[PDB]
Amino acid sequence: SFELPALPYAKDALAPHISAETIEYHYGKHHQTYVTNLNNLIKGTAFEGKSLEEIIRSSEGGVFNNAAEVWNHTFYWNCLAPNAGGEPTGKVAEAIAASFGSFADFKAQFTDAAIKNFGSGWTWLVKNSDGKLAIVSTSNAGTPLTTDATPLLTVDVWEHAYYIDYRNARPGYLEHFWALVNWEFVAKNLAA
Amino acid sequence: SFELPALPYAKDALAPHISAETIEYHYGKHHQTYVTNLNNLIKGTAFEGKSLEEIIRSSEGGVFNNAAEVWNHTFYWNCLAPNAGGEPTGKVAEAIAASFGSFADFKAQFTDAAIKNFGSGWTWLVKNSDGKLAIVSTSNAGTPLTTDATPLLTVDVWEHAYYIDYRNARPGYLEHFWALVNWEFVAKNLAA
Ligand SMILES: [Fe+2]
Ligand SMILES: [Fe+2]
């Protein structure tokens, strides 16, 4: 009985970086469908009373794809915000500087990883179990939740995430992604 | 060095099933970029002098992804045509009827497979070396060329192939795909 969590802002709040139309389809159709599909697939199964994270860590096939995508998108919406972007400060800035050399280095590494993540997928900033930050990419519904690394930030590189606004120019999408990064969410994730 | 083969028709030939803008981007940007990236990866290497097929059957990583996608798209453009679609005749009709019972059954199965293919990929009708026909789906740049089967027909289900025209409605795209199938090409593939 999972529900589609409410968007953290107005559907046109990320314009012009991500259009209101993209949110309408991405959130209203894609994300909503993953929720509906997940609910239908777990009915009557041992997954019924489990948390979303629990299902993601104990499933495969269709149940996994839908559950992971539900979580990935909710995390994604929280990674964005209006009147945000720019450079992080405090603990996040310090951790990024220590793990990548500088914010600029991190930004270039994250951008490159995201652009080169072949096909559909996600690119993440995570804190590995060794306490150091790293950038990793996943394919399709893949998520760091199935590992011992903690997700801090992500960018959806499935084409539906940017085709309406940037067509083939995934790099253009990444450029604008930086103008939307919600460092408050990233900071919360790192502080946990 | 590889050249992007000319499209078998003007970019408006498949409209309204596939729009001129989709062709503009799909052929003019996506396909072209695969050619460019392939060229840059193989320049000055032992992959020079090799056919596209030879590269696909002897590579991995980026070389394979780009080489395979170049071939897949050229094959795809030949699978589509104006004033086509409908149902096959002659040898193609016979083979499909013998393997799937009827064209209607084949059509339903191919469509179902294409819709279910998760993430980016392709759905194919192939002929195994023993003469049996089968429907197989691949992920990302995956192609039957790396197997023992012969590609007869394919549909691109990467989101860029249909998002401009159908957004998330991949089923609608598949319906319109059938109005474009170039059975003459399929017959050539089967007769080889
Ligand atoms: Fe998405
Ligand atoms: Fe394509």
Asked if A36 reaches chain B (Cβ–Cβ under 8 Å), the answer is: no
Residue of A64, A163, A164, A165 to mutate when probing chain B, most B C-beta within 10 A: A163
The partner residues of A135 in beta bridges, in order of sequence, read: A125
> Strand order of the sheet with strand B121-127?
B133-139, B121-127, B150-156
Question: Which class for B109: exposed (0-12), middle (13-18), buried (19 or more C-beta within 10 A)?
Answer: middle
- Resolution for this model in angstroms, one decimal place? 1.7
The partner residues of B141 in beta bridges, in order of sequence, read: none
Maximum Cα–Cα distance across chain B: 50
Q: What are phi and psi of A156, to 5 degrees?
A: -80, 120
B156 CA → ligand 2 middle, Å: 6
Q: Which residues contact A133 (CB under 8 A, 6 or more apart)?
A: A95, A96, A98, A99, A100, A125, A126, A127, A152
Please state, in angstroms and rounded to a whole number, the distance separating the CA atoms of residues B144 and B29. Answer: 24
Q: Which residues contact A61 (CB under 8 A, 6 or more apart)?
A: none
Question: SS3 for chain B, per residue?
Answer: CCCCCCCCCCCCCCCCCCCHHHHHHHHHHHHHHHHHHHHHHHCCCCCCCCCHHHHHCCCCHHHHHHHHHHHHHHHHHHCECCCCCCCCCHHHHHHHHHHHCCHHHHHHHHHHHHHHCCCCEEEEEEECCCCCEEEEEEECCCCHHHCCCEEEEEEECCHHHCHHHHCCCHHHHHHHHHCCECHHHHHHHHHC
Maximum Cα–Cα distance across chain A: 50
- Closest Cα in chain A to B64: A118
Question: Which class for A117: exposed (0-12), middle (13-18), buried (19 or more C-beta within 10 A)?
Answer: buried
Asked if B167 reaches chain A (Cβ–Cβ under 8 Å), the answer is: yes
Please state, in angstroms and rounded to a whole number, the distance separating the CA atoms of residues A79 and A166. Answer: 19
Provide the 10 A C-beta neighbour count for residue B108.
12
A108 Rama class: left (phi>0) / alpha (psi -120 to 50) / beta: alpha
Please state, in angstroms and rounded to a whole number, the distance separating the CA atoms of residues A25 and A43. Answer: 26
The closest alpha carbon to B28, from B82, B88, B73, belongs to B73
Q: What are phi and psi of A82, to 5 degrees?
A: -80, 160
B160 CA → ligand 2 middle, Å: 6
Please state, in angstroms and rounded to a whole number, the distance separating the CA atoms of residues B1 and A120. Answer: 28
Does residue A140 contact residue B118 with C-beta atoms inside 8 Å? yes
Say how far residue A104 (Cα) sits from the centre of its chain: 20
Q: What is the DSSP string of chain A?
A: ----PPPSS-TTTTTTTS-HHHHHHIIIIIIHHHHHHHHHHHTTSTTTTS-HHHHHTT--HHHHHHHHHHHHHHHHHHTB-TT--S---HHHHHHHHHHHSSHHHHHHHHHHHHHTS-SSEEEEEEE-TTS-EEEEEEETT--GGGTTSEEEEEEE-SGGGTHHHHTT-HHHHHHHHTTTB-HHHHHHHHH-
For strands A133-139 and B121-127, give the pairing. unpaired
Q: What are phi and psi of A153, to 5 degrees?
A: -155, 150
The interface residues of chain A toward chain B in range 59-118, judged by CB-CB distance below 8 A, are 65, 118
CB contact under 8 A, A158 and B119: yes
Q: Which residues contact A79 (CB under 8 A, 6 or more apart)?
A: A153, A154, A155, A181, A182, A185, A186
A168 CA → ligand 2 middle, Å: 11
| Ligand with minimal distance to A122 CA | 1
Residue of B35, B162, B168 to mutate when probing chain A, most A C-beta within 10 A: B168
A147 Rama class: left (phi>0) / alpha (psi -120 to 50) / beta: beta
Does residue A55 contact residue A190 with C-beta atoms inside 8 Å? no
Does residue B126 contact residue B134 with C-beta atoms inside 8 Å? yes
Ranges of each domain in chain B: 1-192
